[PDB]
Design a protein around this ligand. Structure first.
Ligand SMILES: N[C@@H](CC(=O)O)C(=O)O
Length: 390
């Protein structure tokens, strides 16, 4: 009767229904879309309110600096490690061998924005413009500025501080209201996915699917589990038990941004103080996408093998860096990781025709990479809290 089991029951029964009815399972697809829309509804107001309240409640900008620096460095390190693992596993298994489809028809798309332009785009020219377009990074930057101001403004900031502190709680309550619909939404999503993706579609790229899932599992049990058990002295089996809801929601939804409310809600029961969680989770939700980096590395290697091109060491490292940047730039919307794969492939010069190969089964890989992305945020929160005085 506990909410998590209800979500689990919905998940399992949706899988069963999709297996039974197959293609016909799309009929129930709209029900899942309602759940996704409801989850998306909460993100932006929740993100802004939580960031502002967390920074304001901390009341120490100097403390904020340490947390931000450590979180950013950890995100970068985990992302590079994830892409490295992806490359290693892709080389070991060679998913793209025994396959060659389509010509190298035409040159790829040039003129992607430079590194400098993306950094300049993180500051909004109009905060309401950022809010309206749902640009997460701009909203987060403005919220950080607002929180610092409130933390330093002092007595005169009490009205704004209290208003946003209450607004964050209101958004959490709204999230709790939505979760009553979570099991049915997950059921519908699983039914749709399983029914749509029949055995025939997966078998041609079964080795690619296995490589991606194995990479995600290896990341979870080697990077996160170690950083919990060896460094933070946290029993990983209890950690994942407490996190389970967020992992399952991310797996079913394939949307880190839409999963953020569940992640934030779960983080409060994790034990980390709310001040660090509020700042870190929104940032990692769009900056920390280690699962995306691993998936992008694996897909790039698969595409390279699909057309006989074997990369030199320099090319593989360029994949490391470009995949890190792409994961940084990827948004938390399903299918985003595949779209950004153009930025990675173009760097090495691999044909973009390979994307057509992945575009079919993409959702099955999106599930795993989104699960890893969501888990990474909570693991980072726990580690940062442990590094400070938890
Ligand atoms: N769907 C993933 C992004 C990706 O496609 O890699 C997410 O929202 O976290």
């Amino acid at each position: 009767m506990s909410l998590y089991h209800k979500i689990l029951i919905g998940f399992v029964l949706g899988v069963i229904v999709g297996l039974i009815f197959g293609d016909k399972a799309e009929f129930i697809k709209p029900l899942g879309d309602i759940f996704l829309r409801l989850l998306k509804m909460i993100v932006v107001p929740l993100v802004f309110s939580t960031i502002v309240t967390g920074i304001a409640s901390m009341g120490d900008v100097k403390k904020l600096g340490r947390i931000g620096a450590k979180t950013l460095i950890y995100y970068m390190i985990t992302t590079t490690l994830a892409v490295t693992i992806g490359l290693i596993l892709a080389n070991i298994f060679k998913p793209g061998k025994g396959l060659s489809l389509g010509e190298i028809h035409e040159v790829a798309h040039p003129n992607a924005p430079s590194f400098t332009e993306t950094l300049l785009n993180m500051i909004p020219t109009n905060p309401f413009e950022a809010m309206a377009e749902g640009n997460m990074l701009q909203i987060i930057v403005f919220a950080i500025f607002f929180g610092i101001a409130l933390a330093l403004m002092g007595e005169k900031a009490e009205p704004v501080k209290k208003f946003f502190d209450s607004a964050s709680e209101v958004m959490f309550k709204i999230t709790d209201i939505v979760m009553k619909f979570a099991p049915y939404g997950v059921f519908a999503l699983m039914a749709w996915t399983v029914g749509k993706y029949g055995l025939d579609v997966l078998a041609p790229l079964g080795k690619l699917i296995l490589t991606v899932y194995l990479g995600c599992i290896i990341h979870i049990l080697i990077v996160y589990t170690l950083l919990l058990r060896f460094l933070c002295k946290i029993n990983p089996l209890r950690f994942f038990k407490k996190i389970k809801e967020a992992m399952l929601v991310a797996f079913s939804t394939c949307s880190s941004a839409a999963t953020l409310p569940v992640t934030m809600r779960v983080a409060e029961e994790l034990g980390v103080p709310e001040s660090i969680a509020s700042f870190t989770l929104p940032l990692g939700a769009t900056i920390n996408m280690d699962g995306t980096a691993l998936y992008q590395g694996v897909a790039a290697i698969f595409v390279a093998q699909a057309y006989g091109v074997e990369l030199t060491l320099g090319q593989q490292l360029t994949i490391v860096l470009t995949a890190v940047l792409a994961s940084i730039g990827t948004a938390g919307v399903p299918g985003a990781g595949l779209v950004m794969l153009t930025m990675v492939l173009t760097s090495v010069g691999l044909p973009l025709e390979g994307i057509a190969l992945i575009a079919g089964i993409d959702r099955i890989l999106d599930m795993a990479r989104t699960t890893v992305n969501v888990t990474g945020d909570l693991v980072a929160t726990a580690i940062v809290a442990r590094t400070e005085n938890e």
